[PDB]
């Protein structure tokens, strides 16, 4: 594989997935083990704790990128507030592409779960969102979506051109153009059989964003109705 130098630098920012998976699994096990039989976290409550912990990993990933670090905290907050849910969904989708089997759901804790089991515990909204995500998983697997392209899409999601009120919007513009050019060069060069792959990759970002917008609004209102157990970071991202 011929990898643009920029993409190699982007990959250095990826967390140690095996270690992240273990740490979140121990946290969720200590959570259930620290309460009795009557107050055990519901499946929904566990997913909230899971997403909450994933958000910590996302924040630490962003702050590990040099480009992100050149921005002041106000700018960093504005970028992360605009895309945290999209990053969560994109991460979940990629996880199904890699460690995924059709009919199953692979979680950030490394647990493999049957799709129909989880789906039957969700309402109409999350069922529709989960099913739409699975359709994206299938489309991306057929395109041979790989880790190099994944990291590129993550940076394109983080450094969005639609975030307003930034001090250093120029840095955000420059990152978007650089990653776009690197991703195009990488995809066209490593997947010549899948022509228009690059265009099909970018066409999926608006779908992933739409899914994550609905998911965020659902959680926000579930929290207002008191259905969301306390998850500091997740709650705080919603209450903004």
């Amino acid at each position: 594989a011929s990898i643009p130098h920029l993409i190699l630098e982007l990959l250095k920012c990826e967390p140690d997935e095996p270690q992240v998976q273990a740490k979140i699994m121990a946290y969720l096990q200590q959570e259930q083990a620290n309460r009795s039989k009557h107050e055990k976290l519901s499946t929904f409550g566990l997913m909230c704790k899971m997403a909450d912990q994933t958000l910590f990993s996302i924040v630490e990933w962003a702050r590990s990128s040099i480009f992100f670090r050149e921005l002041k905290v106000d700018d960093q907050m504005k970028l992360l507030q605009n895309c945290w849910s999209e990053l969560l969904i994109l991460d979940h989708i990629y996880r199904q592409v890699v460690h995924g089997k059709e009919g199953s759901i692979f979680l950030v804790t490394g647990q493999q779960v049957d799709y129909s089991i989880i789906a039957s515990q969700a309402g109409a909204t999350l069922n529709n969102l989960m099913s739409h995500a699975q359709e994206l998983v299938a489309k991306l697997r057929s395109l041979q979506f790989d880790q190099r392209e994944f990291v590129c899409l993550k940076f394109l999601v983080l450094f969005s051109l639609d975030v307003k009120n930034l001090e250093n919007f120029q840095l955000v513009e420059g990152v978007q153009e650089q990653v776009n050019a690197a991703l195009l060069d990488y995809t066209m060069c490593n997947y010549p059989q899948q022509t228009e792959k690059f265009g099909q990759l970018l066409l999926r970002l608006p779908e992933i964003r739409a899914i994550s917008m609905q998911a965020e609004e659902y959680l926000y209102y579930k929290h207002l109705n008191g259905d969301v157990p306390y998850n500091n970071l997740l709650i705080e991202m919603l209450h903004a």
Partner: peptide
Amino acid sequence: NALLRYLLDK
């Protein structure tokens, strides 16, 4: 947004 600000400063 206090906790996110702390995470990015820590």
